[PDB]
Amino acid sequence: NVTTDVGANGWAPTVSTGLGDGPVSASADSLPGRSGGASSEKTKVGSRFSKWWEPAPSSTANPQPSLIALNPSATQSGNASILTGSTAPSLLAYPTATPVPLPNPDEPSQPGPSGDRTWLLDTVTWSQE
Amino acid sequence: NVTTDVGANGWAPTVSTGLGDGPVSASADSLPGRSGGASSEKTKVGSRFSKWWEPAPSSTANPQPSLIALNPSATQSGNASILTGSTAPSLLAYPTATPVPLPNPDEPSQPGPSGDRTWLLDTVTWSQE
Numbered sequence: 001n002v003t004t005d006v007g008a009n010g011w012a013p014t015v016s017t018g019l020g021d022g023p024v025s026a027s028a029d030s031l032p033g034r035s036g037g038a039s040s041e042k043t044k045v046g047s048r049f050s051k052w053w054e055p056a057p058s059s060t061a062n063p064q065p066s067l068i069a070l071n072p073s074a075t076q077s078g079n080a081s082i083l084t085g086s087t088a089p090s091l092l093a094y095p096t097a098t099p100v101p102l103p104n105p106d107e108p109s110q111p112g113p114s115g116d117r118t119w120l121l122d123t124v125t126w127s128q129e
Numbered sequence: 130n131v132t133t134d135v136g137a138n139g140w141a142p143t144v145s146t147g148l149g150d151g152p153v154s155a156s157a158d159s160l161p162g163r164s165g166g167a168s169s170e171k172t173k174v175g176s177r178f179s180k181w182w183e184p185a186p187s188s189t190a191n192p193q194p195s196l197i198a199l200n201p202s203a204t205q206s207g208n209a210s211i212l213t214g215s216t217a218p219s220l221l222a223y224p225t226a227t228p229v230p231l232p233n234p235d236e237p238s239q240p241g242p243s244g245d246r247t248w249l250l251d252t253v254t255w256s257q258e
Contacts, residue, residue: 062203063199065199066199068197068198069197069199
C-alpha cells in the first residue's frame with residue numbers, strides 16, 4: 001500500500017541485474033550454537049570449502065479496591081518473598097523473547113538461587129517537599 | 130367466599146330479567162388503535178350499521194456492605210451516566226404495565242436521546258438543623 005519500496009525482507013535475484021537495480025537488502029544469518037540472549041527462555045567442526053593443497057490488568061469488569069479492602073499478593077525469587085495486603089501492581093513490562101544462537105562456544109556459569117534473588121537495594125525517604 | 134355479590138366481572142343474561150334483577154356490571158371495551166399508555170412497553174374505516182338511504186433486593190443471604198467496601202454500580206440514560214463506588218439502592222418502584230389502544234390516530238413525536246436522558250434537576254444543601 002505504498003509507492004516506495006519497503007524491501008522484500010531479503011535478497012532476490014531480480015533486484016540486482018545488469019539491466020536494472022533496486023534497493024539492496026540484508027538476509028537473516030543462519031548460525032549454529034548455544035541458545036542464549038533472551039532471558040527466562042534460554043536453555044566435529046569442518047570448513048565448507050576445498051583447499052588448494054588438499055585432494056487484563058486494567059478492566060472495568062474487574063475493578064481493584066482501595067487500600068482498605070483485603071486484596072493480597074506476593075512476589076517470590078530465590079529464598080526471598082515480599083507480601084502485601086492491598087491492591088498492588090505487578091507486571092512484566094515486556095513479554096520475554098525467543099532465544100538466539102551464541103557466537104561463543106563456552107558453557108555459561110550460573111549463580112542460581114544465591115544470585116537470582118530479591119535483594120534490598122536501598123532504603124530512601126520520600127518527603128512532601 | 131362472601132354472601133354479597135362482588136360481580137361476575139361482566140354482563141350476564143341472567144342478571145337483568147323481567148322476573149329478577151341483580152347488580153349491573155360493566156364489561157371491557159374492545160377497541161382498535163395504536164398501542165400506547167404504558168411507558169417502556171408501548172410500540173379502510175367503515176361503520177357497522179346500515180343507513181336508511183343506502184341500499185431479591187433485601188435478603189440476609191446477600192448482605193450489602195457499608196460505605197467502606199467496594200461495591201460499584203451505575204445508571205445510564207441517553208448520553209448521561211452516574212457512577213458510585215459503594216452500596217446504592219436502584220429500583221423501579223412498580224413493574225411496567227401492558228400497552229393499550231389509543232383513542233387518537235396521530236403518530237407520536239419522540240425526542241429520543243436528546244430528551245430521554247439524565248438531567249441535573251437541582252443542587253441543594255442538606256444541613257443538620
